[PDB]
Short mmCIF file of C-alpha atoms in Angstrom, two decimals:
data_model
loop_
_atom_site.label_atom_id
_atom_site.label_comp_id
_atom_site.label_asym_id
_atom_site.label_seq_id
_atom_site.Cartn_x
_atom_site.Cartn_y
_atom_site.Cartn_z
CA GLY C 149 106.65 131.19 71.00
CA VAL C 150 106.85 133.19 74.22
CA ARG C 151 109.46 131.83 76.64
CA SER C 152 111.15 132.87 79.87
CA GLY C 153 114.65 133.04 81.35
CA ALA C 154 116.68 132.84 84.55
CA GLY C 155 116.11 135.28 87.38
CA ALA C 156 112.75 136.55 86.10
CA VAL C 157 111.06 136.48 89.52
CA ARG C 158 112.81 139.61 90.80
CA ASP C 159 112.55 141.32 87.40
CA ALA C 160 108.75 141.38 87.65
CA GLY C 161 109.09 143.14 91.01
CA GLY C 162 105.93 141.50 92.34
CA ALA C 163 105.18 139.92 95.69
CA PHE C 164 107.60 137.03 95.12
CA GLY C 165 110.53 139.26 94.16
CA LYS C 166 110.15 141.38 97.29
CA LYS C 167 109.70 138.20 99.35
CA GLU C 168 112.93 136.74 97.96
CA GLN C 169 114.84 139.98 98.55
CA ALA C 170 113.58 140.22 102.13
CA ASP C 171 114.38 136.57 102.85
CA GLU C 172 117.91 136.92 101.48
CA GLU C 173 118.50 140.13 103.44
CA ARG C 174 117.19 138.65 106.69
CA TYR C 175 119.32 135.51 106.29
CA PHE C 176 122.50 137.38 105.39
CA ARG C 177 122.03 139.91 108.20
CA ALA C 178 122.23 136.99 110.65
CA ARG C 179 125.20 135.55 108.76
CA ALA C 180 126.97 138.93 108.86
CA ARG C 181 126.27 139.17 112.59
CA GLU C 182 127.78 135.72 113.17
CA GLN C 183 130.82 136.54 111.02
CA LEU C 184 131.33 139.84 112.86
CA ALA C 185 131.16 138.05 116.22
CA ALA C 186 133.69 135.45 115.05
CA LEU C 187 135.99 138.14 113.64
CA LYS C 188 135.84 140.11 116.89
CA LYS C 189 136.65 136.98 118.90
CA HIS C 190 139.59 136.30 116.57
CA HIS C 191 140.82 139.91 116.80
CA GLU C 192 140.76 139.72 120.60
CA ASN C 193 143.44 137.02 120.27
CA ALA M 78 98.78 146.84 82.17
CA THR M 79 101.44 147.42 79.53
CA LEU M 80 103.19 144.76 77.48
CA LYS M 81 106.40 144.85 79.54
CA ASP M 82 104.59 144.34 82.85
CA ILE M 83 102.61 141.40 81.46
CA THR M 84 105.78 139.81 80.06
CA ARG M 85 107.63 140.21 83.36
CA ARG M 86 104.78 138.74 85.41
CA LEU M 87 104.29 135.86 82.97
CA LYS M 88 107.99 134.96 83.00
CA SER M 89 108.13 135.14 86.80
CA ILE M 90 105.10 132.87 87.12
CA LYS M 91 106.61 130.46 84.59
CA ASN M 92 109.78 130.22 86.68
CA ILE M 93 107.71 129.73 89.84
CA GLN M 94 105.75 126.94 88.14
CA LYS M 95 108.94 125.17 87.07
CA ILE M 96 110.37 125.42 90.60
CA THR M 97 107.15 124.13 92.16
CA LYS M 98 107.03 121.16 89.78
CA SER M 99 110.66 120.30 90.50
CA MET M 100 109.97 120.48 94.24
CA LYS M 101 106.92 118.27 93.70
CA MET M 102 109.12 115.61 92.09
CA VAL M 103 111.71 115.92 94.87
CA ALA M 104 109.00 115.57 97.51
CA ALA M 105 107.61 112.54 95.66
CA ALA M 106 111.02 110.86 95.79
CA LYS M 107 111.44 111.68 99.48
CA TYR M 108 107.92 110.39 100.14
CA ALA M 109 108.77 107.12 98.40
CA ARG M 110 111.90 106.73 100.54
CA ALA M 111 109.98 107.54 103.73
CA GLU M 112 107.23 105.09 102.76
CA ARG M 113 109.82 102.36 102.26
CA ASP M 114 111.47 103.15 105.61
CA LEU M 115 108.18 103.45 107.53
CA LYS M 116 107.31 99.74 107.67
CA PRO M 117 110.18 98.60 109.96
CA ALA M 118 109.64 101.80 111.96
CA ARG M 119 105.91 101.05 112.16
CA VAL M 120 106.64 97.54 113.45
CA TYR M 121 109.17 98.92 115.94
CA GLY M 122 106.71 101.48 117.28
CA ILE M 123 103.88 98.96 117.55
CA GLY M 124 106.18 96.60 119.44
CA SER M 125 107.29 99.41 121.75
CA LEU M 126 103.69 100.39 122.52
CA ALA M 127 102.50 96.77 122.83
CA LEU M 128 103.36 96.56 126.54
CA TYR M 129 101.21 99.59 127.37
CA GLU M 130 98.52 98.31 124.99
CA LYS M 131 98.29 95.00 126.88
CA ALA M 132 98.45 96.65 130.32
CA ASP M 133 95.98 99.17 131.75
CA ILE M 134 98.70 101.72 132.45
CA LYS M 135 96.66 104.86 133.14
CA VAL M 136 97.54 107.96 135.13
CA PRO M 137 95.83 107.64 138.55
CA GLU M 138 94.94 111.29 139.18
CA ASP M 139 96.10 114.88 138.69
CA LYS M 140 99.85 115.48 138.41
CA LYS M 141 101.65 118.78 138.90
CA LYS M 142 103.92 118.56 135.84
CA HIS M 143 103.25 117.49 132.26
CA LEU M 144 105.55 117.37 129.23
CA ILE M 145 104.18 117.68 125.69
CA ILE M 146 106.35 116.44 122.82
CA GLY M 147 105.38 118.21 119.61
CA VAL M 148 107.12 116.42 116.75
CA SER M 149 107.45 118.56 113.61
CA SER M 150 109.97 119.64 110.98
CA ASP M 151 111.85 122.84 110.16
CA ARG M 152 110.80 123.12 106.51
CA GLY M 153 107.69 124.95 105.37
CA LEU M 154 105.41 124.52 102.34
CA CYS M 155 103.96 121.45 104.08
CA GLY M 156 100.35 122.64 104.05
CA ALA M 157 98.48 122.21 107.33
CA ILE M 158 100.82 119.67 108.97
CA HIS M 159 102.48 122.19 111.27
CA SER M 160 99.19 124.06 111.62
CA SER M 161 97.36 120.90 112.71
CA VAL M 162 100.04 119.83 115.20
CA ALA M 163 100.22 123.37 116.61
CA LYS M 164 96.44 123.45 117.03
CA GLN M 165 96.51 120.06 118.77
CA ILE M 166 99.32 121.04 121.13
CA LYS M 167 97.65 124.36 121.94
CA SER M 168 94.37 122.60 122.74
CA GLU M 169 96.12 120.02 124.91
CA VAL M 170 98.12 122.71 126.74
CA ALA M 171 94.97 124.72 127.45
CA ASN M 172 93.06 121.63 128.61
CA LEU M 173 95.83 120.47 130.94
CA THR M 174 96.47 123.98 132.28
CA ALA M 175 92.77 124.35 133.10
CA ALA M 176 93.37 121.64 135.73
CA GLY M 177 96.21 123.64 137.31
CA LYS M 178 99.03 121.40 136.04
CA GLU M 179 102.43 122.83 135.15
CA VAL M 180 102.78 122.44 131.38
CA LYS M 181 106.12 122.29 129.57
CA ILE M 182 106.49 121.65 125.84
CA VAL M 183 109.40 120.31 123.79
CA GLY M 184 109.36 120.99 120.06
CA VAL M 185 111.73 119.11 117.76
CA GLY M 186 110.69 121.30 114.81
CA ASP M 187 111.75 124.92 114.50
CA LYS M 188 108.37 125.64 112.90
CA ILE M 189 106.65 124.56 116.12
CA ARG M 190 108.95 126.85 118.10
CA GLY M 191 108.15 129.75 115.78
CA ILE M 192 104.40 129.15 115.92
CA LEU M 193 104.18 128.69 119.70
CA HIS M 194 106.81 131.28 120.66
CA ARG M 195 104.36 134.17 120.30
CA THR M 196 102.33 132.86 123.25
CA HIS M 197 103.84 129.66 124.70
CA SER M 198 107.41 130.96 124.82
CA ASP M 199 107.99 130.21 128.51
CA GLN M 200 106.58 126.67 128.25
CA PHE M 201 109.40 125.68 125.86
CA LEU M 202 111.70 123.19 127.60
CA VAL M 203 114.26 122.29 124.90
CA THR M 204 113.98 123.18 121.22
CA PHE M 205 115.56 121.13 118.43
CA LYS M 206 116.17 121.99 114.78
CA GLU M 207 117.47 120.46 111.53
CA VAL M 208 114.52 118.04 111.36
CA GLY M 209 113.23 117.00 107.95
CA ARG M 210 116.30 118.20 106.05
CA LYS M 211 117.51 114.59 106.24
CA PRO M 212 115.52 111.42 106.96
CA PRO M 213 115.16 110.92 110.72
CA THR M 214 117.02 108.08 112.42
CA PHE M 215 117.20 106.49 115.85
CA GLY M 216 120.37 108.40 116.75
CA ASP M 217 118.62 111.77 116.63
CA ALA M 218 115.68 110.41 118.62
CA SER M 219 118.09 108.99 121.20
CA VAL M 220 119.81 112.38 121.50
CA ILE M 221 116.43 114.10 121.91
CA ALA M 222 115.37 111.66 124.64
CA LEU M 223 118.77 111.97 126.34
CA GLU M 224 118.53 115.74 126.57
CA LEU M 225 114.86 115.45 127.55
CA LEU M 226 115.93 113.44 130.59
CA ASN M 227 118.90 115.77 131.14
CA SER M 228 116.62 118.82 130.99
CA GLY M 229 115.83 118.40 134.70
CA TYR M 230 112.05 118.56 134.18
CA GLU M 231 110.80 115.41 135.94
CA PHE M 232 107.35 115.33 134.35
CA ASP M 233 105.21 112.83 136.25
CA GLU M 234 102.88 112.51 133.24
CA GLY M 235 103.85 112.92 129.60
CA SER M 236 102.50 112.74 126.07
CA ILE M 237 103.63 113.05 122.46
CA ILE M 238 101.84 114.61 119.47
CA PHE M 239 102.66 113.74 115.86
CA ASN M 240 101.07 113.52 112.42
CA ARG H 5 166.17 117.96 59.23
CA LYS H 6 164.91 114.38 59.42
CA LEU H 7 163.17 113.55 62.69
CA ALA H 8 165.01 111.20 65.03
CA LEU H 9 163.38 107.78 65.30
CA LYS H 10 161.79 106.94 68.65
CA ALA H 11 159.69 104.16 70.14
CA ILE H 12 156.00 104.59 70.88
CA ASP H 13 155.13 105.98 74.32
CA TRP H 14 153.37 102.78 75.35
CA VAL H 15 152.38 101.67 78.86
CA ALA H 16 156.06 100.94 79.47
CA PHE H 17 156.54 104.72 79.59
CA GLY H 18 154.32 104.76 82.67
CA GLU H 19 155.93 101.54 83.93
CA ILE H 20 158.96 103.54 85.14
CA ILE H 21 157.19 104.57 88.38
CA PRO H 22 160.20 106.59 89.57
CA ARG H 23 160.35 107.43 93.27
CA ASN H 24 158.67 110.85 93.40
CA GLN H 25 159.28 110.91 89.63
CA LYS H 26 155.82 110.16 88.23
CA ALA H 27 155.47 113.91 87.80
CA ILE H 28 158.81 113.82 85.97
CA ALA H 29 157.47 111.12 83.63
CA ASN H 30 154.30 113.14 83.01
CA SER H 31 156.45 116.19 82.25
CA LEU H 32 158.49 114.10 79.81
CA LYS H 33 155.29 112.97 78.09
CA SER H 34 154.18 116.60 77.87
CA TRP H 35 157.57 117.50 76.38
CA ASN H 36 157.14 114.74 73.78
CA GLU H 37 153.66 116.00 72.88
CA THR H 38 154.93 119.58 72.60
CA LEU H 39 157.85 118.44 70.44
CA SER H 40 155.46 116.59 68.13
CA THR H 41 153.26 119.69 67.89
CA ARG H 42 156.27 121.89 67.13
CA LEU H 43 157.50 119.47 64.46
CA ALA H 44 154.05 119.46 62.85
CA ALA H 45 153.85 123.27 63.13
CA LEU H 46 156.49 124.02 60.47
CA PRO H 47 158.27 122.11 57.69
CA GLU H 48 161.74 120.56 57.93
CA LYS H 49 163.41 123.66 56.45
CA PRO H 50 162.32 127.28 56.04
CA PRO H 51 160.99 128.48 52.68
CA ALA H 52 163.42 129.51 49.97
CA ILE H 53 164.22 133.16 49.25
CA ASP H 54 163.11 134.60 45.90
CA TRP H 55 166.31 136.56 45.37
CA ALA H 56 165.54 137.36 41.72
CA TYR H 57 162.05 138.68 42.48
CA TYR H 58 163.45 140.54 45.49
CA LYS H 59 166.07 142.29 43.35
CA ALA H 60 163.41 143.07 40.74
CA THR H 61 161.29 144.62 43.51
CA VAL H 62 164.28 146.26 45.27
CA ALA H 63 164.78 149.83 44.09
CA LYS H 64 167.67 150.36 46.52
CA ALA H 65 171.19 149.90 45.16
CA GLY H 66 173.83 148.12 47.23
CA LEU H 67 171.69 147.68 50.34
CA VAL H 68 169.77 144.89 48.57
CA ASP H 69 172.47 143.02 46.63
CA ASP H 70 174.80 142.99 49.64
CA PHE H 71 171.89 141.84 51.82
CA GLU H 72 171.25 138.91 49.48
CA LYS H 73 174.97 138.11 49.41
CA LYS H 74 175.08 138.09 53.22
CA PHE H 75 171.94 135.93 53.39
CA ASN H 76 173.58 133.43 51.03
CA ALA H 77 176.74 133.59 53.15
CA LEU H 78 174.63 133.34 56.31
CA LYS H 79 175.00 129.91 57.92
CA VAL H 80 173.08 129.42 61.17
CA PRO H 81 174.72 126.73 63.35
CA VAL H 82 173.03 123.75 65.01
CA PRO H 83 172.83 122.90 68.73
CA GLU H 84 174.94 120.23 70.40
CA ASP H 85 173.61 117.12 72.15
CA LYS H 86 176.22 116.32 74.80
CA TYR H 87 173.45 115.99 77.38
CA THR H 88 171.87 113.35 75.14
CA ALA H 89 175.07 111.29 75.26
CA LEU H 90 175.34 111.75 79.03
CA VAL H 91 171.74 110.61 79.53
CA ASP H 92 172.40 107.65 77.22
CA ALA H 93 175.40 106.66 79.35
CA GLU H 94 173.30 106.99 82.51
CA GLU H 95 170.60 104.82 80.93
CA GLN H 96 173.25 102.25 80.00
CA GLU H 97 174.46 102.15 83.60
CA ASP H 98 170.87 101.77 84.80
CA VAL H 99 170.37 98.95 82.29
CA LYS H 100 173.49 97.21 83.60
CA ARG H 101 172.14 97.50 87.15
CA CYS H 102 168.78 96.15 85.96
CA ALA H 103 170.54 93.22 84.27
CA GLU H 104 172.39 92.41 87.50
CA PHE H 105 169.13 92.59 89.45
CA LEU H 106 167.43 90.37 86.87
CA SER H 107 170.22 87.79 87.14
CA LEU H 108 169.92 87.80 90.93
CA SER H 109 166.14 87.43 90.67
CA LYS H 110 166.54 84.57 88.19
CA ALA H 111 168.86 82.79 90.63
CA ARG H 112 166.34 83.35 93.42
CA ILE H 113 163.58 82.02 91.15
CA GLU H 114 165.62 78.90 90.41
CA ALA H 115 166.12 78.37 94.14
CA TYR H 116 162.40 78.87 94.80
CA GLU H 117 161.45 76.43 92.03
CA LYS H 118 163.87 73.85 93.42
CA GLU H 119 162.38 74.31 96.89
CA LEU H 120 158.84 73.95 95.52
CA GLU H 121 159.78 70.78 93.64
CA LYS H 122 161.43 69.37 96.77
CA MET H 123 158.32 70.16 98.83
CA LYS H 124 156.05 68.55 96.24
CA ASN H 125 158.16 65.39 95.96
CA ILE H 126 158.93 65.03 99.69
CA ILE H 127 155.23 64.80 100.62
CA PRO H 128 155.26 60.96 100.20
CA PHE H 129 152.84 59.13 102.49
CA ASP H 130 150.77 60.97 105.08
CA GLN H 131 152.02 58.40 107.63
CA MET H 132 155.35 60.17 108.05
CA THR H 133 157.40 60.86 111.18
CA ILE H 134 156.78 63.69 113.63
CA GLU H 135 160.39 64.82 113.22
CA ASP H 136 160.02 64.45 109.45
CA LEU H 137 157.13 66.94 109.48
CA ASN H 138 159.54 69.57 110.84
CA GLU H 139 160.83 70.01 107.28
CA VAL H 140 157.75 72.11 106.44
CA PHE H 141 156.36 72.55 109.96
CA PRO H 142 158.75 72.49 112.94
CA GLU H 143 158.14 73.37 116.57
CA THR H 144 159.98 75.97 118.67
CA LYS H 145 162.07 76.12 121.85
CA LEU H 146 160.80 76.14 125.43
CA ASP H 147 158.15 78.63 126.58
CA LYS H 148 156.68 78.80 123.07
CA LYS H 149 153.39 76.83 122.99
CA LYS H 150 151.42 79.24 125.15
CA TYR H 151 148.06 77.64 124.30
CA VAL X 166 118.05 119.36 56.30
CA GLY X 167 118.86 117.26 59.36
CA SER X 168 121.49 114.54 59.53
CA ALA X 169 121.60 114.24 55.73
CA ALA X 170 124.27 116.98 55.82
CA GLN X 171 126.71 115.02 58.00
CA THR X 172 129.47 112.48 57.56
CA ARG X 173 128.65 108.95 58.65
CA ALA X 174 130.87 109.08 61.74
CA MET X 175 129.61 112.51 62.78
CA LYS X 176 126.02 111.38 62.17
CA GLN X 177 126.58 108.22 64.22
CA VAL X 178 127.95 110.10 67.22
CA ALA X 179 125.53 113.02 66.80
CA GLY X 180 122.35 110.95 66.91
CA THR X 181 123.31 109.57 70.31
CA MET X 182 124.51 112.96 71.55
CA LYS X 183 121.28 114.64 70.41
CA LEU X 184 119.10 112.01 72.08
CA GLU X 185 121.06 112.21 75.34
CA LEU X 186 121.04 116.02 75.36
CA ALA X 187 117.29 116.06 74.75
CA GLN X 188 116.86 113.67 77.68
CA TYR X 189 119.03 115.93 79.84
CA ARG X 190 117.16 119.10 78.84
CA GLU X 191 113.96 117.29 79.80
CA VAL X 192 115.28 116.79 83.35
CA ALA X 193 117.36 119.98 83.64
CA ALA X 194 114.83 121.56 86.01
CA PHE X 195 115.76 119.21 88.87
CA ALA X 196 119.50 119.98 88.71
CA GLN X 197 119.12 122.36 91.66
CA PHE X 198 117.80 119.53 93.87
CA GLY X 199 119.35 116.62 91.98
CA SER X 200 121.01 115.10 95.05
CA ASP X 201 117.70 113.69 96.32
CA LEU X 202 116.55 112.31 92.98
CA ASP X 203 116.30 108.98 91.18
CA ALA X 204 119.45 107.21 90.05
CA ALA X 205 118.34 107.44 86.41
CA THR X 206 117.68 111.18 86.77
CA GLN X 207 121.11 111.74 88.34
CA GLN X 208 122.77 109.71 85.59
CA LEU X 209 120.98 111.79 82.96
CA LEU X 210 122.02 115.00 84.72
CA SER X 211 125.67 113.91 84.85
CA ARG X 212 125.72 112.82 81.21
CA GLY X 213 124.06 116.04 80.07
CA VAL X 214 126.43 118.22 82.10
CA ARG X 215 129.42 116.42 80.60
CA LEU X 216 128.01 116.72 77.07
CA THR X 217 127.36 120.44 77.62
CA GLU X 218 130.94 120.87 78.82
CA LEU X 219 132.01 119.09 75.63
CA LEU X 220 129.97 121.50 73.50
CA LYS X 221 131.93 124.49 74.83
CA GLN X 222 134.59 125.78 72.45
CA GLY X 223 137.00 128.69 72.32
CA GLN X 224 136.88 131.54 69.84
CA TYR X 225 138.81 131.48 66.55
CA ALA X 226 139.70 127.81 67.17
CA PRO X 227 137.76 125.67 64.68
CA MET X 228 138.13 121.91 64.95
CA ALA X 229 138.52 119.31 62.22
CA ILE X 230 135.66 116.89 61.69
CA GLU X 231 137.71 113.89 62.86
CA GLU X 232 138.72 115.70 66.06
CA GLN X 233 135.09 116.60 66.78
CA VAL X 234 133.89 113.05 66.12
CA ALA X 235 136.63 111.67 68.39
CA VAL X 236 135.69 114.04 71.22
CA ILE X 237 131.97 113.30 70.86
CA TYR X 238 132.74 109.57 70.80
CA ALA X 239 134.78 109.88 74.00
CA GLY X 240 131.83 111.72 75.53
CA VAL X 241 128.73 109.77 74.51
CA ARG X 242 130.30 106.35 75.18
CA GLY X 243 130.50 107.14 78.90
CA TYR X 244 134.24 107.79 79.25
CA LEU X 245 133.65 111.01 81.21
CA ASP X 246 131.09 110.05 83.87
CA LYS X 247 133.75 109.44 86.53
CA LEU X 248 135.67 112.56 85.48
CA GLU X 249 134.95 115.84 87.24
CA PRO X 250 132.60 118.08 85.21
CA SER X 251 134.96 121.06 85.57
CA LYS X 252 137.88 119.00 84.23
CA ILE X 253 136.22 118.15 80.89
CA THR X 254 137.73 121.15 79.09
CA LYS X 255 141.27 120.35 80.24
CA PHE X 256 140.71 116.69 79.39
CA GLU X 257 139.29 117.67 76.00
CA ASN X 258 142.31 119.82 75.12
CA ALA X 259 144.83 117.24 76.35
CA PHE X 260 143.05 114.41 74.52
CA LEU X 261 142.94 116.46 71.31
CA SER X 262 146.67 117.14 71.57
CA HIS X 263 147.38 113.45 72.24
CA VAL X 264 145.29 112.15 69.35
CA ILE X 265 146.68 114.75 66.94
CA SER X 266 150.28 114.03 67.95
CA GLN X 267 150.48 110.26 68.43
CA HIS X 268 147.34 108.86 66.76
CA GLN X 269 147.28 110.94 63.58
CA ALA X 270 146.82 107.77 61.52
CA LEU X 271 143.43 107.00 63.06
CA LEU X 272 142.22 110.56 62.51
CA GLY X 273 143.38 110.45 58.90
CA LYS X 274 141.63 107.13 58.35
CA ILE X 275 138.41 108.51 59.85
CA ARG X 276 138.65 111.62 57.65
CA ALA X 277 139.33 109.67 54.45
CA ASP X 278 136.78 106.91 55.06
CA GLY X 279 134.23 109.35 56.47
CA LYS X 280 132.79 106.77 58.89
CA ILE X 281 133.78 105.27 62.25
CA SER X 282 133.98 101.60 61.32
CA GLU X 283 134.06 98.75 63.83
CA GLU X 284 137.84 98.41 63.63
CA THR X 285 138.19 102.16 64.10
CA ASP X 286 135.62 101.89 66.89
CA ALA X 287 137.80 99.36 68.72
CA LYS X 288 140.92 101.46 68.14
CA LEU X 289 139.16 104.55 69.50
CA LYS X 290 137.97 102.53 72.49
CA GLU X 291 141.53 101.45 73.27
CA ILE X 292 142.90 104.98 72.84
CA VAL X 293 140.27 106.66 75.01
CA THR X 294 140.60 103.98 77.69
CA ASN X 295 144.38 104.42 77.82
CA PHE X 296 144.19 108.21 77.94
CA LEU X 297 141.47 108.16 80.61
CA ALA X 298 143.57 105.76 82.69
CA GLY X 299 146.64 107.97 82.31
CA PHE X 300 144.84 111.30 82.74
CA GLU X 301 145.20 111.44 86.53
CA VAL R 105 148.94 69.23 106.36
CA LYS R 106 147.29 69.25 102.92
CA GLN R 107 146.32 72.91 103.33
CA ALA R 108 149.84 73.76 104.47
CA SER R 109 151.37 72.01 101.45
CA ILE R 110 149.03 73.65 98.94
CA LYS R 111 149.63 77.05 100.56
CA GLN R 112 153.40 76.55 100.28
CA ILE R 113 153.24 75.52 96.63
CA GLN R 114 150.91 78.36 95.63
CA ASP R 115 153.14 80.83 97.49
CA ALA R 116 156.14 79.56 95.52
CA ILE R 117 154.20 79.81 92.25
CA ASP R 118 153.05 83.39 92.85
CA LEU R 119 156.54 84.46 93.94
CA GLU R 120 157.89 82.97 90.70
CA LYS R 121 155.33 84.90 88.66
CA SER R 122 156.07 88.13 90.54
CA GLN R 123 159.79 87.79 89.85
CA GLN R 124 159.03 87.00 86.20
CA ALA R 125 157.21 90.33 85.92
CA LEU R 126 159.89 92.16 87.93
CA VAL R 127 162.81 91.07 85.74
CA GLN R 128 161.04 92.38 82.62
CA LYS R 129 159.73 95.67 84.01
CA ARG R 130 163.08 97.33 84.75
CA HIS R 131 164.59 97.09 81.28
CA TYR R 132 161.19 97.65 79.64
CA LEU R 133 160.96 101.02 81.39
CA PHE R 134 164.65 101.86 80.89
CA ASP R 135 164.38 101.45 77.11
CA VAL R 136 161.45 103.89 76.96
CA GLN R 137 163.31 106.35 79.19
CA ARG R 138 166.26 106.24 76.79
CA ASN R 139 163.90 106.74 73.85
CA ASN R 140 162.26 109.77 75.49
CA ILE R 141 165.71 111.25 76.11
CA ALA R 142 166.13 111.38 72.33
CA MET R 143 162.63 112.85 71.98
CA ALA R 144 163.54 115.80 74.20
CA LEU R 145 166.45 116.76 71.93
CA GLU R 146 164.59 117.14 68.62
CA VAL R 147 163.31 120.72 68.49
CA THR R 148 166.62 122.56 68.99
CA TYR R 149 167.87 123.53 65.52
CA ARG R 150 164.40 123.98 64.03
CA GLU R 151 163.76 127.23 65.93
CA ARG R 152 166.84 129.00 64.56
CA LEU R 153 166.41 127.54 61.08
CA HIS R 154 162.83 128.79 60.85
CA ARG R 155 163.42 132.19 62.45
CA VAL R 156 166.49 133.30 60.46
CA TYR R 157 164.74 133.18 57.08
CA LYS R 158 161.69 134.98 58.46
CA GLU R 159 163.91 137.73 59.87
CA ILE R 160 165.77 138.19 56.57
CA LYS R 161 162.50 138.21 54.61
CA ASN R 162 161.13 140.86 56.98
CA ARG R 163 164.29 142.91 56.43
CA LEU R 164 163.72 142.74 52.67
#
């Protein structure tokens, strides 16, 4: 019987894999910006 | 296509199906909780609106300002809920602006802000977020009303749009 | 090497409740478990030496017979347990202190039982005297009954 | 061949463990969003996670049948639900050491008899309750 | 007055029970502490006894 596994959405490299990659990158770019701002504010101290 | 491409696509769609079914069950549970909690809220809202139901409280004539309260959530995948409320608020804004009345809109859902920010960016008064992630309660509504009064926009006439 | 007899680590082991010493008691329990595991790991004594088979399989002359003679003459010593006696003396002193505390508590219990019996017997009739009620419920000095 | 190739005690614990693990694998999809789920579903998720943590085993460290049946008994009878899922392995190792060291008689009786009788069931209940109480 | 009397008598009873537990607990724990002291001492000589024969056998 044919089955599947974990993390097979990005393996197919279809629309959903690219969508997930773009969403993760866009979220973590904002998170990196916030962390950089906080680190700069801390380093000013 | 080849065998490998078919296998990859089939496995990806299988995973997507499993995730969608799990989210369906989660949404069913949340819907059951909301349905249980709606009845006291329904009674409370009917009681609150009873005074204006039993009194002909109608706006006399044109008023310069007007606040529109578009209640929505931050989450997506909700179908046409956000689409319907956005269409309704856009229609109301256009209709009230045709009469030369200053229109300001408050959106408690980030989705409403995203949808209306392409065109009605200036009309935003105060935007709220983190709605729908947890069941709403009177504390959040009280905070929203408090900052609505504190916004400094003394709207002579007001309205609220919800699903 | 017969194992030393010891009592079971029952709930009384955890009944010590030493001041900042519960970790010490847990460590002692871990030591007991490790000692049991070590005892089960190997027999009481090491295996015997097949000196005859060794000599039959030993082509070397002198280096083997003298080695066997030294092994026979070899006598590993055994450790001392002075700390065990010291800890036993400390436990005896603690037991004496516990006995004194138990005697004091028994005297206090006898006093409390006598007081309870006196209170039960002295109840008598409800129609007692106001001053008589001060035995179990007296008033105070001036500027006391605020309400 | 099924359960016909098992000792009575191992069969008794293994039927319950198999049923519970099947129930967990049925509802394993919702583990990502299990916080906002039914109480029964969350209970099944917790029991299955604890059983899965019990199934883990190190390499080159085979276990005797009595030790396995004791661990599975301590698991299926709901003596791990309160315990943290990450602490199951440490608890499993400590409990194995304790039962091997102090309660060797019960393990020997289970091995010789081949079944977890009612008296042995009560003794195991007492032992697991005491060790769970003293674990913290 | 009845409530006061019953409160007094129950207080005396529970204090008596508490002291009855307290007198036992100290020596009950001290005995086990003394027993564990002996437990700690066991494994000393076994190490040397087991290792010496292994070393000599390895030499052979």
